[PDB]
Amino acid sequence: KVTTVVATPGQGPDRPQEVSYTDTKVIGNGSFGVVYQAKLCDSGELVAIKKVLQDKRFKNRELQIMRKLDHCNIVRLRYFFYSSGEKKDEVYLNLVLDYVPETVYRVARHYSRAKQTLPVIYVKLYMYQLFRSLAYIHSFGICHRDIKPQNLLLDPDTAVLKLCDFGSAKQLVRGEPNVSYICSRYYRAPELIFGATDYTSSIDVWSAGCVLAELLLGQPIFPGDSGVDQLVEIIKVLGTPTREQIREMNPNYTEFKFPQIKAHPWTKVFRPRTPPEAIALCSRLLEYTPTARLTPLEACAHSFFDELRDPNVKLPNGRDTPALFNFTTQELSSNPPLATILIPPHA
Ligand SMILES: N#Cc1ccc(Nc2nccc(C(=O)Nc3cnccc3-c3ccccc3)n2)cc1
Incomplete structure (x- = not known):
């Protein structure tokens, strides 16, 4: 046919x-x-x-x-x-x-069902490629608004990741309101849970931090079928949001009472063999204050991705790693000095 x-x-x-x-x-x-x-x-x-x-x-x-x-x-x-x-x-x-x-959802599901975690080389490759795609779309003011494992396409032979499903994507303009009901269960930034309509592109960074943590854990970091259940899971890791942090993610919610949980140490949240660089990267993406989270380009430059920059690195299947360093002026525009780290001497 x-x-x-x-x-x-x-x-x-x-x-x-x-x-x-x-x-x-x-x-x-x-x-x-x-x-x-x-x-x-x-x-x-x-x-x-x-x-x-x-x-x-x-x-x-x-x-x-x-x-x-x-x-x-x-x-x-x-x-x-x-x-x-x-x-x-x-x-x-x-x-x-x-x-x-393939998708990151299907691949991660194989590992979780077999009682195993995805090898950290693949966590690095996939997470790095996601942060590049975000750096690129954010350089135009475009926010994806639905970052989740099902939207992260994968070619298993080449280890290439491609962001897909731009159905909720929008160019965010400061002062123009946006619908708060975008983004899927488990991956919603706390400002979206509190129904904020004045959010920034940094909601994608919270979603990406949730994907990283889920790949490290083998299960979602902040599960729950309601926002209140999701919020208790967030407060258990991050500790109680201060009045200032709450004001930064929807100020209409400052007078509400929240459970008093002390700031849990991020080292205890993951398995003992978890690379401390991955944990440090998580703590910098999953922050209450939207402006405190790393930008996608700053996350690309994180020490967790140093292995990707080594000239001898190869995929487990023996092949070369995919394109990782072909940055454009458009892609680096949020912080041009980072090219010093992002493009290694051998590239
Ligand atoms: N199972 C499965 C499976 C695995 C790989 C692909 N491959 C593929 N290749 C290029 C583009 C797209 C795409 O635009 N998809 C979507 C676009 N918009 C919304 C949702 C989806 C979507 C639906 C289901 C799963 C993942 C994404 N998908 C498709 C399905």
């Missing part, structure tokens, strides 16, 4: 072309719509097709964001096209993206 469409390339100028594909199978479903896998007839390359319902009143925000992104750790929009679908008289937007076979 061959489907031919007239699709517009994602990057470059608006000059459509005939794209033919086959072997269409469903690989994802949800409130967003459906993600398919397909093979392009010309090259034989696998692609993913995200199909979503198109709002008649305005251009799809995810498409506007995707057309402006170009980074090795962000899934690439190859083409886009409009089509019919399940609901009659409704137009659908189809995003043809580069296909990535």
Whole structure:
């Protein structure tokens, strides 16, 4: 079964072309719509097709964001096209993206089910690539707003990580309010739990810190089906937020009473074989004050990633590590001096 469409390339100028594909199978479903896998007839390359319902009143925000992104750790929009679908008289937007076979969720689940942890070399590779993708999107004012393991795509043979699902992504403008109900259970920053509408891109850094801790532990660090349960788990690790810290993440919640828990030592939260650099990185990402958390680029420069910068490092499968040092001026713009650390002498 061959489907031919007239699709517009994602990057470059608006000059459509005939794209033919086959072997269409469903690989994802949800409130967003459906993600398919397909093979392009010309090259034989696998692609993913995200199909979503198109709002008649305005251009799809995810498409506007995707057309402006170009980074090795962000899934690439190859083409886009409009089509019919399940609901009659409704137009659908189809995003043809580069296909990535695995997710951090599935991979971590294998390890947790086998009563093991993912080797720290992979924790470093994946976490570093996530912080690069965040550094890049944050350099445009764009916040992902839904960082979680299912959104971190992985190619197991090359150890490449690609951030995906820009359905909640938004360019945050200071003074313009944002909906607080974005971000998934376990990964929500405490300002989002308190329903703040004036949050910054630093909510992605809290989410990434939750992913790091979960990869170190083998289970979520702040679980719970309600915000109050999530908050008790946060207070158990971080200690009680001060009135000042509470004011920094939604000031309308300053008069509420919180359980009095003393600041637990981060060394006791993880298994004894956990690298102290990973623990130090966690404590700097999972902070109450949104401005106290490391930026993505500062996290890339952390000592936990020094092994990645060694010229002799190789993947466990014997292959070379993927591209890690091809930083652009755009990507370094939050702190250009960091290139001194980020690009090692051998690169
Ligand atoms: N199981 C599975 C599985 C594993 C790998 C892929 N590969 C892949 N490759 C390129 C792009 C995308 C993509 O844009 N996905 C999404 C986009 N928007 C929302 C949600 C998703 C999504 C849904 C389910 C799982 C993970 C992401 N996914 C797909 C499914």
